[PDB]
Write a protein that binds this ligand. Sequence first.
Ligand code: HEM
Ligand code: GKX
Ligand code: 1Y5
Ligand code: STQ
Length: 455
Amino acid sequence: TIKEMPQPKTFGELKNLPLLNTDKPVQALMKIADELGEIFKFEAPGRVTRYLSSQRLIKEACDESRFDKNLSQALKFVRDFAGDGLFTSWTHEKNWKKAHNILLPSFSQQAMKGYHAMMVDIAVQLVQKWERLNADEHIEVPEDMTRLTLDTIGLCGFNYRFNSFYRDQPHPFITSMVRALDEAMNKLQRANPDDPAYDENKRQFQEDIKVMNDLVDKIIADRKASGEQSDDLLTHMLNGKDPETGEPLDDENIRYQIITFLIAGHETTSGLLSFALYFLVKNPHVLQKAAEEAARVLVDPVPSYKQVKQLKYVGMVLNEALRLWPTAPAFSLYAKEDTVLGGEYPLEKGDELMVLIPQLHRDKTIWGDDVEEFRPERFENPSAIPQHAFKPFGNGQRACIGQQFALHEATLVLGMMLKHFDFEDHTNYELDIKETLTLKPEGFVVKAKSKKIPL
Ligand code: HEM
Ligand SMILES: O=C(CCCCC1CCCCC1)N[C@@H](Cc1ccccc1)C(=O)O
Ligand SMILES: N[C@@H]1CCCc2ccccc21
Ligand SMILES: N[C@H]1CCCc2ccccc21
C-alpha cells in the first residue's frame, strides 16, 4: 500500500544538502540509513535522490527492464575528464555499447593470462620493498597498495611505468588526477557554485584536465607512430573493431577509457587490498587459514596464473572484505518508466535512486546474526547467497568490466603478502575511512616480519 518515504532533517531552503557538508558523506548516508531504514528521500535545491539499503528494494532496482544506470552528480562532474568512457557514459550513448563490445575480450579471464606477468612485476616490487624495511620501520598500507594498483594498470593498460615505489611524491599525472577527483566530489557541497570564491578551484580544474589529456594523448600518439604491438589495453583499443557497428574507437574515446582505467587503478583495488589486510590483522584465526593456503599453493618463487586460481580462501577473504567495506560504495539508477517500488513507493519516469552498497551488505535478513563478523566461509557456496544480496561490482550490463582484473591482481598480491610475511597490528589501529570516489582506511599501518622465503 502507498507509503510516504522517510526523510532526514532539513535546513530550510537548503533542504537536506548540509547533511553532506562533510569529508565523509557516504558514512553520513550510512548513519541516516541506520536511523531511517531501507529507503529515504534526500532533497537539495532542484533535486531529489532516494537511498536504498535493503536487499528487498535493491533486488527490484537491479531489474534492468525497470531501471538503468544513472550518472549521479558525482559521475557528471567526473565526466568533465572521463568523458564518454565506459564508466561515465549513458547506456543509450553509441560509444557505451561500442567500447563495451571492443573491450570485453581485453577484460576476460582468458586475458588475465596475458596480464599476469606484468601484475607479478609490480607485486614483486611491493614484496622487495617490504623485505628491505629495517626492524624499526612500519608499512603505510593504503599508500603502498595504491602505489601497486596504479603501477599495475599503467603497465597492463599502456606499457607505462609510473615507478610509484621509486617515489615519495606521485607522478605529476597522478597529482592532477587526484586533484580533479577531489574537485568533482567537493563541487557536490557548493550551495552557490558560481560565487567567485571558487574561481581558483575552476582554473586549477582546467589545468589538471589539461595535464591528464596531454600525457594520455601523447602516449596514444607515441604508440601509433612506433607501430609497437604490446599486449596491453591500448594495443587492443587501436586494433579492435566493434562487431556491431564494425567501427573502431576514435583517439578521443581511447583517451577517456585510459583516464577511466587509471582512476580505477588508483581508487578501487587499492581500497580492497587495504580493507582485506585490515580484517586479516583484526582476525588472526582468519589470517592463519589464509597464510596456510598461500604456503600450500604458492610453491614457486613467482606465482603462476593457475596457482592464483587455486587461492580459493584468499578469494573468500577478498569477497568478505568487499562485503563489510565495499571500496566502491554506491551506484545510481533511474526509473525507465513510471513504476512502484516494493508495492509501497511510487516513482515517476526519470526518478533517481542511489544503492548504498555498505548497507545492502549489512542486511541482517540476508546475512544473519553474525553480520558484523569477518567470516570468509560465508562465501563457500555462491548458490547459498540470496539473489542481489552482494553487489560490490554493480549490476547487470553496467557492472564493473574490471572485476576479473581486480580480483586476479588482489588475489595474487594478498597471496604473495601472506606467503612472504607475518603481520603485526603494532598500533591497535582504529579504523578511519577516507572518502574520494571510493573508501580507504586512512593511517592504517602494520609491521611485517619476513618469513625469509626467496623470490
Ligand atoms: C575492487 C575493485 C573494483 C571495484 C570494487 C569496482 C566497482 C565498480 C562498480 C560498483 C561499478 C559500477 C558503477 C556504476 O554502476 O556506476 C564499476 C564499473 C566499472 N569499473 Fe570497476 N571496480 C573495481 C575495479 C576496476 C578496475 C581495476 C577497472 C579497470 C581497469 C574498472 C573499470 C570499471 C569500468 C570501466 C566500469 C564501467 C563499466 C560499464 O558501465 O561498462 N574497475 N566498477
Ligand atoms: O550520494 C551522493 C554523495 C555520495 C556519492 C558517492 C558515490 C560517488 C560516485 C562513485 C560511487 C560513490 N551523491 C549523489 C546525490 C547528490 C547530488 C548532489 C549533491 C549532493 C548529493 C550524486 O552525486 O548524485
Ligand atoms: N570501478 C569504477 C571505475 C573506476 C572508479 C570507480 C569509482 C567508484 C565506483 C566504480 C568505479
Ligand atoms: N600514488 C603513489 C605514487 C607514488 C607516491 C605515493 C605516495 C603516497 C601514496 C601514493 C603514492
